[PDB]
Amino acid sequence: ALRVGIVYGTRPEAIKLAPLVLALDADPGFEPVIITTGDEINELFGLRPRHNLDIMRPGQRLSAMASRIVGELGDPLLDELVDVAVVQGDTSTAFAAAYAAACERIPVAHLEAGLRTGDRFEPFPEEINRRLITQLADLHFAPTADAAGNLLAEGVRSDDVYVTGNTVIDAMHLVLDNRELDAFTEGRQTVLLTMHRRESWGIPMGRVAAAVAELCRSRPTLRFVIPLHPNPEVRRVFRSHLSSLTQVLLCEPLRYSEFIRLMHRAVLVLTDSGGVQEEAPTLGKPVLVLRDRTERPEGIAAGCARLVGTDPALIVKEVGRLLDDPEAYEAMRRPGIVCYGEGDAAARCLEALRERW
Amino acid sequence: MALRVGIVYGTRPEAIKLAPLVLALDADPGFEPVIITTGLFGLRPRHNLDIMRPGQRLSAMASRIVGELGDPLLDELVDVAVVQGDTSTAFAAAYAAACERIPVAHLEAGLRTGDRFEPFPEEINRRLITQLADLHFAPTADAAGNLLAEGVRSDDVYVTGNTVIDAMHLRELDAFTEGRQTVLLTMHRRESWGIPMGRVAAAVAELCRSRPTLRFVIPLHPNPEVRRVFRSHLSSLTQVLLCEPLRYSEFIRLMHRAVLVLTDSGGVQEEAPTLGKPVLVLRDRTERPEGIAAGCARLVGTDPALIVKEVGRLLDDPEAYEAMRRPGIVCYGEGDAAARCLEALRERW
Ligand code: NA
Ligand code: NA
């Protein structure tokens, strides 16, 4: 049976790999072997790591992380007799893991391959990681035809590229199968607002807080759920502005299951998160991006996402249009699924693996 | 404050091709070269990391270089890092530089065999370095073309040529070779060991018997199985000197004196034609096909009849000799390449 290495270090990697892992378990042709470089999410999907290297820490030098992964991942890959190594996305784990696999002459498959902003070292190091992984990988699981196109421009052979789609829709269905969050949202149009980036802290958060106030004052039927940042100085702003409004629930940081349950119930999503810009349109949610740029420009091009920055007049206007113009809402909802790839992607990865090996 | 240019290498061939760029960066008042090593020209290393060893795991080498090169690059306030060729140093160094947001320039960029993981890890290294580098010093138009196929912007690619010709210009086997036409024969590859080395040994014997005026110098590999064959066949021949591995200065001096070169070395397939030496390649394939196309090299395998024939033609037909000598020297790129690298650096930064 083909022994398939699954290497990740972070929650977003684990979420996108889980449906491939589960499908590799179920199919008798393959044996998945999970090695981590970075637990809640392991328990939620039923992922049982065989090795936990414990490399990654907060505020560790990129060079230190890469060095430990490049130095230490080979031995467990060899001990577990791994035939192929799968890495995911644009992470420094995925790059360092792929180089480690290539040093032992172990073929690499890449889940979610071919995404390009066309903006060198923006973001850093995600953009260079993508291009390095693309040179190391024998097999490329592209989420869309456009992604596949980008791999060809970088010298990848057509026979190595499969349009597999995106596993994230399958991972979110798996967690779709709570106290007041259900009571607060039921019967109402609810906005999910996640705002967490460091450049968003202080003044911009206040500007977004004022927009929420305005919308709540104009639209009595409208509700907002706003997860508060775990840093007391940061969560101070939203409390000082919004705690007295009955139409606004300020909650503690959410676990993944509660979070995507809430996102599924919401009518639209306001976020500065690259992850949420992908997840929300995949569940059919129009996204306003609380930034003047994005790491996911595909959503802007397809029209399932819209840059709104932290301008309160624009946020009010843009939220209004979507609540009042069912045409406007659909023109963001329709392109949203299929923008980041079709679902049932795990099965398409297995076919490509069964064909090559 | 001059533009501080990091020069990172671990091996002799890197150091050889970088030396003329280093010397030119020294001379020019707009730049300051800073040599960091990972493993005769007047190269002054500022930091020597004794990372590399014989028979060390690639993953161990890459890990130490990726982990340890950043700090010295930052301490020495390096603005740009230059790496050379297809080495694991050049790749690991480039990633280390990129982690500290230091731009990378690549000397001898764009060579592609079109044969994935052959050789390993040189072929993947080339493609990784190409993604990391901001500036590409391609030795030829064809190399530049290969960088575009992998998504490199035309603005970042300069046809600089090849520094190796400039680097090369910088007793008992003297007695043996003086006044005679001397053939240099270097043979090391594993697939060549045993029977094929005997076939090459027999060709040398035949040529020596037919041409009493002809001489051969054959540096012996440190592998006893290689020394055994050559000894059994060639130790009794007066016209054949079997010597120990040569120092680089004596080796290039010998190659300059030689009338032609027989080799299974990719390095020598480049160096010999660059000094105007016709090359017979002791292989059925090559990682330097440009030399075959230009006609300064010829595949001869280990076929004794062909070796005899091919050596004969060149020794007897001075027209045939020139038709292999001329297309060398600028087959692997034009010279004066260091100056072209400086121009490209001064243009971008
Ligand atoms: Na299985
Ligand atoms: Na200088």
Author numbering:
A (entry chain A): 2 to 39, 46 to 184, 191 to 370
B (entry chain B): 1 to 39, 51 to 181, 192 to 370
Q: What does the report in the manuscript say about this coordinate set?
A:
Here we report a structural and functional analysis for an epimerase, KasQ, that primes KSM biosynthesis rather than the previously proposed KasF/H, which instead acts as an acetyltransferase, inactivating KSM. Our biochemical and biophysical analysis determined that KasQ converts UDP-GlcNAc to UDP-ManNAc as the initial step in the biosynthetic pathway. To better understand the catalytic mechanism of KasQ, we solved crystal structures of KasQ for the wild type (WT) and its complexes with UDP or UDP-Glc in resolutions of 2.44 Å, 2.58 Å, and 2.09 Å, respectively. In brief, each monomer consists of two domains (N-terminal and C-terminal domains), in which each subdomain is made of a typical sandwich (αβα) architecture of a Rossmann fold.
In consistence with homodimers in solution, an asymmetric unit contains two monomers colored in rainbow (N-terminal blue, C-terminal red) and gray. Superimposition of these two monomers with an RMSD of 0.86 Å for 317 Cα atoms indicated no significant conformational differences. Two fragments marked in dashed lines (residues 40–45 in the N-terminal domain and residues 184–190 in the C-terminal domain) are missing from the model due to lack of electron density, likely a consequence of structural disorder/flexibility in loop regions. The N-terminal domain is constituted by residues 1–170 that fold into a central seven-strand β-sheet (β1–β7) sandwiched by α-helices (α1–α7) on each side along with a stand-alone α16 helix (residues 357–370). The C-terminal domain is formed by residues 201–359 composed of a central six-strand β-sheet (β8–β13) sandwiched α-helices (α9–α16) on each side. The N-terminal and C-terminal domains are connected by two helices, α7–α8 (residues 173–199). The cleft between these two domains provides the substrate binding pocket. A sodium ion was observed in coordination with the carbonyl backbone of N-terminal residues Leu25, Asp26, Asp28, and Phe31.
